[PDB]
Amino acid sequence: PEWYYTGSAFYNPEPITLANTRYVSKDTKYQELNNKLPPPLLS
Amino acid sequence: PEWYYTGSAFYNPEPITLANTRYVSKDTKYQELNNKLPPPLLS
């Protein structure tokens, strides 16, 4: 599926960028994206 | 010497990545590295 970003105090889907994400270590509970990739995960 | 990262509440050495480091200004008490470099410093 396509993943968006929203604020915690208001529902508003937004593009996933480096202005609202932080890099973390890999966990087994994280979603593995293969078809579509946000610009933080693209290279 | 080779440097690793560990949590503050449990001792477990880990590779130094961008997921656990922040970029800071130069200081005189910081370690000078010439032989080996973490990927935050190599890139």
Structure description:
- This is part of a larger assembly, with 2 copies of chain A (43 residues).
- Chain A is low in regular secondary structure.
- Chain A has no helices and no strands.
- Chain A is globular and about 25 Å long.
- Chain A binds chain B through residues 23-25, and chain B through 17-20.
- It is classed as viral protein.
- Keywords: spike protein, viral protein.
- The entry is titled "Cryo-EM structure of Japan-BatCoV (Vs-CoV-1) S-trimer".
- Chains A, B: Spike glycoprotein,Fibritin.
Q: Short summary of the structure?
A:
The structure is cut from a larger assembly and holds 2 copies of chain A (43 residues). In chain A, 0% of the residues lie in helices and 0% in strands.
List the helices and strands and how they pair.
The structure is cut from a larger assembly and holds two copies of chain A (43 residues).
Chain A: no helix or strand
